């Protein structure tokens, strides 16, 4: 569990890792701000795992980057509601098809 | 085309037919070229060497006839088409124009001099080769059409 | 419920095709089973298939007389139950005889032998048990029709009533069947009940079941649900503790150990081919996991040098190049390779604009449906 | 016992005819279609019928010409159009067909003199009598007398009412020669009409099939694919046994020629494999590019394609395979090494690969923009496809059409008859 | 239409098999051998 | 793009609704 704490400390340092990646647009694989190998298992290596899901919201480039992107327009309810409405409407259309087939024959 | 059940088959029929076929490719009526091909399914098959040369040429044309230009010529020097092959040969394809040469590739004089050079269009191949408001007018009409439907 | 058939025998029979050279390993136990439960038809089938056994069938025929004795006992007990005033005693006697037959062989045990018992069903639980017996025997011989019919019988009405253990057994049976088929989402979901699996006769033991559960989940399940279910499954954790290699394989992907992950993929592919009821799909499994690993690794990076992949994976570089090319061509991996520069990029997001793509996709189908309806109704 | 099935089945025809007559003066196209369907599925069901059709109202062969000779209009036309159904279904194939066509000619003479309730029932049953003409034809041989009469009747079709079966019959004449008659479709191009009513809805798909065929003959895949697919869309009926297998064969061979690689997971219908597996073999060979295997399968399955009127198409694809393969390579990468692609496609050498790429620049796979230098093959696909300006038209006009197709609405509110 | 003579367990998987039907010669294990040989 | 997306949605919905108010209700032969 101490190890988990150690990664937790790195997890706590993740905030400091947030510091390194909040002021600039990153673009520095030089981890001089912290104290770790420039390629310490893929740089800090937290960016990789962090980039998955619980992320700094960056893209990384593998040529030197870590550029934060900031997805400012994910929640556009247009798409979700339109898709759901189309699904239910096609269900209704199938129902009407059955009704018309039965009524005609 | 005439039924002509009595029509006695002659070796000329096959020879002459290929001449059209060879010419048809010459006049870049490729659609017509296949049209004739499908008219003689029993001829082409595997026999009828007379008409076998053009089809090989056509295949080479859809494939790289440019390299195979002289391969088919050497495949059979003559098939009673001594002149027939001549028209095709002198009608060298030049679709390769969509590329770069002339001190940019340098290979593919008289060709480099024809109509000044190559066939004439463009320039020296080494040196050869957004707006909403314009969209505004076109879109405006489209939008009204949708409204026009909602009239009645 | 009981070890009516021998899934071990079935596994040996299947595996006795390519590596049938080690007679000690498989043929000896098969003979033991043949001399056990009076399994006449199975060993006769195995005989006619490959081996003769010569003299070592007369003694089998001798126990056939023993089976005949049991068969004769049937008559006796039959009449004893038939003359007996009490009802359902004939039913129990003939059910026992049919059980002895089914261990003896498929056809005799199957069919009326059980169906007739299923005709007279005083007890709902008893007939549900007979249905389960039919399902098990059908699975042993890979009788898809029988499997479907038994499943329909169980889930249609036999399911009605309070029988929880029956529900668990039925869920496990459906899961195993779906595993035999190349559909994995259903199997992964159905193996949720890994907490309460008893020690079912069908499965060799708990370990094999958990191994199948982890395998199916690691394909069907998704990363969040992956960490939630398999990674935190207490009993799952104990089981994988029992089996080290599987544990390392599972954790390798989640913790992003890739070279060892590929070694695990190789060994598990070998085992997958070796086994029965799963082997026919090994190629699909391996290719799917390769696709998954590539997709996971590439997701983080918007750009990537193939040298990095080579380092992360095995040293070689041609393998990753050709595999990426193939999968890109197949339409997976949602990337775009490049040469000379030796870089790989990402592509459009699903929710960014592919929202519009999906909307148009669904709209096309809706439009076709409405058009056909209009044509039909418009006389 | 045999009479009872007949005694129950051959009497409802009288009720149907009574309804047809009653509505004749009402007028047609709203009741006729049901009677035509009943006629069809009676024909599939098919003695004493010639005697029972005796002059139903007053005020084999001798049975054929007895009624009108006896005490004697749309009903008369229908009776004259359905005395040949017995032999038709029985398909005696004897001269009795030569006894049947005169009834058709007499019916043709009868109907021509009529004229429009006739144009709404007799005109359409003219379609099935033409079907029988063609059947009676192919039984012996093709003939253009039907073609001449059809061409003459085109002008009448240009009158108040129009059926489109005539185009189908003209295509039948074309296909009779098949690969031999290619000027016929050249005519059909200009002679093409609208016939948008599509009232039959089966003639439309039928003609679309052969339109796709002729287009494919000239290798115009870009539109041949869509027309063939749309035709296949309009085929709700079973039409399985040897009916749609030809359409599928044509569509899949055309697609393979174009460059797309299909997979049997698409169709894999139970009643197709036995007849369509040769295409599976050839497509499997193509996807890889094993020329030796390709010629092996070709010479093994010499027939079928020869008998399916598609041998030439596969023979020409035998060299388009290279383009088919190169499509994928061009799609995958974004900056290709010419030598490497040459190795991948087992090409001769770098200049050959460069020439092949140039030949492939034409139209189709995303531009290559070969630089003729170290860049080799660029194949820089267009980017910015994000519902943004770059797909301004791309992701606007698509929706514009998808919504302008809402004319289904105006059709719907223009349909209600609301009788009385 | 008529007038036309001519004429998972086994489905939902043709694509997978055909895609690599040629391959599987290495079973990912000969692949491992070749890989380590590097 | 957003305006045209909602336009397509409303067009489809209007189509279905008007069809139902159509034949479903208009196709009453009533013997």
UniProtKB/Swiss-Prot annotation, chain A:
Superkingdom classification of source: Eukaryota
Posttranslational mods: Phosphorylated by AMPK.
Compartments (UniProt record): Nucleus; Cytoplasm, Cytosol
Function description: Component of the 26S proteasome, a multiprotein complex involved in the ATP-dependent degradation of ubiquitinated proteins. This complex plays a key role in the maintenance of protein homeostasis by removing misfolded or damaged proteins, which could impair cellular functions, and by removing proteins whose functions are no longer required. Therefore, the proteasome participates in numerous cellular processes, including cell cycle progression, apoptosis, or DNA damage repair. In the complex, PSMD11 is required for proteasome assembly.
The protein's assembly and partners: Component of the 19S proteasome regulatory particle complex. The 26S proteasome consists of a 20S core particle (CP) and two 19S regulatory subunits (RP). The regulatory particle is made of a lid composed of 9 subunits including PSMD11, a base containing 6 ATPases and few additional components.
Family: Belongs to the proteasome subunit S9 family.
Name this protein carries in UniProt: 26S proteasome non-ATPase regulatory subunit 11
Annotated organism of origin: Homo sapiens
First and last residues shown, out of full length: 318 to 422 of 422
Curated annotation (Swiss-Prot), chain B:
Keywords of the record: Isopeptide bond, Phosphoprotein, Proteasome, Ubl conjugation
Coiled-coil parts of chain: none
Family under the similarity heading: Belongs to the proteasome subunit S14 family.
Known partners and oligomeric status: Component of the 19S proteasome regulatory particle complex. The 26S proteasome consists of a 20S core particle (CP) and two 19S regulatory subunits (RP). The regulatory particle is made of a lid composed of 9 subunits including PSMD8, a base containing 6 ATPases and few additional components. Interacts with DDI2. Interacts with TASOR.
Protein name: 26S proteasome non-ATPase regulatory subunit 8
Keyword Ligase applies: no
GO CC annotations on file: cytosol; nucleoplasm; nucleus; proteasome accessory complex; proteasome complex; proteasome regulatory particle; proteasome regulatory particle, lid subcomplex
Residue intervals of the PCI domain: 1-133
Origin: domain of life: Eukaryota
Biological function: Component of the 26S proteasome, a multiprotein complex involved in the ATP-dependent degradation of ubiquitinated proteins. This complex plays a key role in the maintenance of protein homeostasis by removing misfolded or damaged proteins, which could impair cellular functions, and by removing proteins whose functions are no longer required. Therefore, the proteasome participates in numerous cellular processes, including cell cycle progression, apoptosis, or DNA damage repair.
A single BP term in Gene Ontology: proteasome-mediated ubiquitin-dependent protein catabolic process
Keyword Ubl conjugation on entry: yes
Range covered out of full length: 176 to 350 of 350
Swiss-Prot record, chain E:
Main location: nucleus
Signal peptide feature range: none
Keyword Disulfide bond annotated: no
GO biological process, one term: mRNA export from nucleus
GO cellular component, one term: nucleoplasm
Tissue: Expressed in limb bud, craniofacial primordia and skin.
Keywords for this protein: Nucleus, Proteasome
Superkingdom assignment: Eukaryota
Cellular compartment(s): Nucleus
Protein biosynthesis in keyword set: no
InterPro entries for this protein: DSS1_SEM1
Family in the record: Belongs to the DSS1/SEM1 family.
Quaternary structure annotation from Swiss-Prot or TrEMBL: Component of the 19S proteasome regulatory particle complex. The 26S proteasome consists of a 20S core particle (CP) and two 19S regulatory subunits (RP). The regulatory particle is made of a lid composed of 9 subunits including SEM1, a base containing 6 ATPases and few additional components. Belongs to the TREX-2 complex (transcription and export complex 2), composed of at least ENY2, GANP, PCID2, SEM1, and either centrin CETN2 or CETN3. Component of the homologous recombination repair (HR) complex composed of ERCC5/XPG, BRCA2, PALB2, DSS1 and RAD51. Interacts with the C-terminal of BRCA2.
Protein name as annotated: 26S proteasome complex subunit SEM1
Protein's organism: Homo sapiens
Gene from which the chain derives: SEM1
UniProtKB/Swiss-Prot annotation, chain F:
Domain of life where this protein originates: Eukaryota
Family, similarity comment: Belongs to the peptidase M67A family.
Assembly and interaction partners: Component of the 19S proteasome regulatory particle complex. The 26S proteasome consists of a 20S core particle (CP) and two 19S regulatory subunits (RP). The regulatory particle is made of a lid composed of 9 subunits including PSMD7, a base containing 6 ATPases and few additional components. Within the complex, PSMD7 interacts with subunit PSMD4 through their respective MPN domain. Interacts with TRIM5.
More info: Does not bind a metal ion.
Role, per record: Component of the 26S proteasome, a multiprotein complex involved in the ATP-dependent degradation of ubiquitinated proteins. This complex plays a key role in the maintenance of protein homeostasis by removing misfolded or damaged proteins, which could impair cellular functions, and by removing proteins whose functions are no longer required. Therefore, the proteasome participates in numerous cellular processes, including cell cycle progression, apoptosis, or DNA damage repair.
Listed name of the protein: 26S proteasome non-ATPase regulatory subunit 7
Source organism (scientific name): Homo sapiens
Organism ancestry: Eukaryota, Metazoa, Chordata, Craniata, Vertebrata
Gene from which the chain derives: PSMD7
Entire protein: shown range: 261 to 291 of 324
């Amino acid at each position: 569990i101490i190890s988990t704490h150690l990664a937790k400390l790195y997890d706590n340092l993740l905030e400091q890792n947030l510091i390194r990646v909040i002021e600039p647009f990153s673009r520095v694989q030089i981890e001089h701000i912290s104290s770790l190998i420039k390629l310490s298992k893929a740089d800090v290596e937290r960016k990789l795992s962090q980039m998955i899901l619980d992320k700094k919201f960056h893209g990384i480039l593998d040529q030197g980057e870590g550029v934060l992107i900031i997805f400012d327009e994910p929640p556009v309810d247009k798409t979700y509601e339109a898709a759901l409405e189309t699904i239910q409407n096609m269900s209704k259309v199938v129902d009407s098809l059955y009704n018309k087939a039965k009524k005609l024959t | 085309f005439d039924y002509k059940e009595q029509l006695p088959e002659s070796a000329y029929m096959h020879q002459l037919l290929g001449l059209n076929l060879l010419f048809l490719l010459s006049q870049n009526r490729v659609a017509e070229f296949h049209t004739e091909l499908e008219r003689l399914p029993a001829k082409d098959i595997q026999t009828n060497v007379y008409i076998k040369h053009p089809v090989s040429l056509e295949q080479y044309l859809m494939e790289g006839s440019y390299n195979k230009v002289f391969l088919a010529k050497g495949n059979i020097p003559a098939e009673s088409y001594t002149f027939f092959i001549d028209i095709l040969l002198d009608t060298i394809r030049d679709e390769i124009a969509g590329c770069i040469e002339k001190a940019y590739e340098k290979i593919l004089t008289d060709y480099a001099k024809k109509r000044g050079w190559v066939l004439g269009p463009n320039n020296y191949y080494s040196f050869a080769s957004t707006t909403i408001p314009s969209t505004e007018l076109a879109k405006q009409v489209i939008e009204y059409a949708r409204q026009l439907e909602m009239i009645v | 419920l009981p070890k009516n058939p021998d899934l071990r025998i079935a596994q040996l029979r299947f595996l006795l095709s390519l590596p049938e050279h080690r007679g000690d390993a498989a043929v000896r136990d098969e003979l033991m089973a043949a001399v056990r439960d009076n399994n006449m038809a199975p060993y006769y089938e195995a005989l006619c298939k490959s081996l003769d056994w010569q003299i070592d069938v007369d003694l089998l025929n001798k126990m056939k007389k023993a089976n005949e004795d049991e068969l004769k006992r049937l008559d006796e007990e039959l009449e004893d139950a038939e003359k007996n005033l009490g009802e359902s005693e004939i039913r129990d006697a003939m059910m026992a005889k049919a059980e002895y037959l089914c261990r003896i062989g498929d056809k005799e045990g199957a069919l009326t032998a059980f169906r007739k018992t299923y005709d007279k069903t005083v007890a709902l639980g008893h007939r549900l048990d007979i249905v389960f017996y039919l399902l098990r025997i059908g699975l042993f011989y890979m009788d898809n029709d029988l499997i479907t019919r038994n499943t329909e019988k169980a889930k249609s009405l036999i399911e009605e009533g309070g029988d929880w253990d029956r529900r668990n057994r039925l869920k496990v049976y459906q899961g195993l069947y779906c595993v035999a088929i190349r559909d994995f989402k259903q199997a992964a979901e159905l193996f949720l009940d890994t907490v309460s699996t008893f020690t079912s006769y069908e499965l060799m033991d708990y370990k094999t079941f958990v191994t199948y559960t982890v395998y199916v989940s690691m394909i069907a399940l998704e990363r969040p649900d992956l960490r939630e279910k398999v990674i935190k499954g207490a009993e799952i954790l104990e089981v994988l503790h029992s089996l080290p290699a599987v544990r390392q394989y599972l954790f390798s992907l989640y913790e992003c150990r890739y070279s060892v992950f590929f070694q695990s993929l190789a060994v598990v592919e070998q085992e997958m081919k070796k086994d029965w009821l799963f082997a026919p799909h090994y190629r699909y499994y391996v290719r799917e996991m390769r696709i998954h690993a590539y997709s996971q690794l590439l997701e983080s990076y918007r750009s990537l040098t193939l040298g990095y992949m080579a380092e992360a994976f095995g040293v070689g570089v041609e393998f990753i190049d050709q595999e990426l090319s193939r999968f890109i061509a197949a339409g997976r991996l949602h990337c775009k390779i490049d040469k000379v520069n030796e870089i790989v990029e990402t592509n459009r997001p699903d929710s960014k604009n592919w929202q519009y793509q999906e909307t148009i996709k669904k709209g096309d189908l809706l439009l076709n449906r409405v058009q056909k309806l209009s044509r039909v109704i418009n006389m | 016992p045999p009479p009872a099935p007949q005694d129950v089945e051959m009497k409802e025809e009288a009720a149907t005819g009574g309804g047809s007559t009653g509505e004749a003066d009402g007028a047609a196209a709203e009741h006729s279609q049901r009677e035509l369907d009943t006629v069809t599925l009676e024909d599939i069901k098919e003695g004493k019928e010639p005697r029972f059709v005796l002059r139903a109202l007053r005020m084999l062969l001798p049975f054929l010409e007895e009624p009108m000779d006896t005490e004697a209009r749309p009903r008369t036309g229908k009776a004259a159009s359905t005395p040949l159904l017995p032999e038709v279904e029985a398909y005696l194939q004897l001269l009795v067909v030569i006894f049947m066509m005169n009834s058709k000619r007499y019916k043709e003479a009868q109907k021509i003199s009529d004229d429009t309730q006739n144009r709404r029932a007799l005109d359409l049953v003219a379609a099935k009598c033409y079907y029988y003409h063609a059947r009676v034809y192919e039984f012996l041989d093709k003939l253009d007398v039907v073609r001449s009469f059809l061409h003459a009747r085109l002008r009448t079709a240009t009158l108040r009412h129009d059926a489109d079966g005539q185009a189908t019959l003209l295509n039948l004449l074309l296909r009779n020669y098949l690969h031999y008659s290619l000027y016929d479709q050249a005519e059909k191009l200009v002679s093409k009409s609208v016939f948008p009513e599509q009232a039959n809805n089966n003639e439309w798909a039928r003609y679309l099939y052969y339109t796709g065929r002729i287009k494919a003959i000239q290798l115009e895949y870009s539109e041949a694919r869509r027309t063939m697919t749309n035709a296949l869309r309009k085929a709700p009926q079973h039409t399985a046994v040897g009916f749609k297998q030809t359409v599928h064969k044509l569509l899949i061979v055309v697609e393979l020629l174009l460059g797309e690689i299909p997979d049997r997971l698409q169709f894999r219908q139970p009643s197709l494999k036995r007849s369509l597996m040769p295409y599976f073999l050839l497509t499997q060979a193509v996807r890889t590019g094993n020329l030796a295997k390709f010629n092996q399968v070709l010479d093994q399955f010499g027939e079928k394609f020869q008998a399916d009127g598609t041998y030439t198409l596969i023979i020409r694809l035998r060299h388009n395979v290279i383009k088919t393969g190169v499509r994928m390579i061009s799609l995958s990468y974004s900056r290709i090494s010419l030598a490497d692609i040459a190795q991948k496609l087992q090409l001769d050498s770098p200049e050959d690969a460069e020439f092949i790429v140039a030949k492939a620049i034409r139209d189709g796979v995303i531009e290559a923009s070969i630089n003729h230098e170290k860049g080799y093959v660029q194949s820089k696909e267009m980017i910015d496809i994000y519902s943004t300006r770059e797909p301004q038209l791309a992701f606007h006009q698509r929706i514009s059409f998808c919504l302008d197709i809402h004319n289904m609405s105006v059709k719907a509110m223009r349909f209600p008859p609301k009788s009385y | 239409e008529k007038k036309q003579p001519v004429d998972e367990d086994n489905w939902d998987d043709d694509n997978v098999e055909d895609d690599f039907s040629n391959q599987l010669r290495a079973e990912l294990e000969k692949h491992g051998y070749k890989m380590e040989t590097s | 793009y957003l305006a045209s997306l909602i336009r397509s949605v409303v067009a489809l919905h209007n189509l279905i609704n008007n069809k139902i108010a159509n034949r479903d209700a208009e196709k009453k032969e009533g013997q």
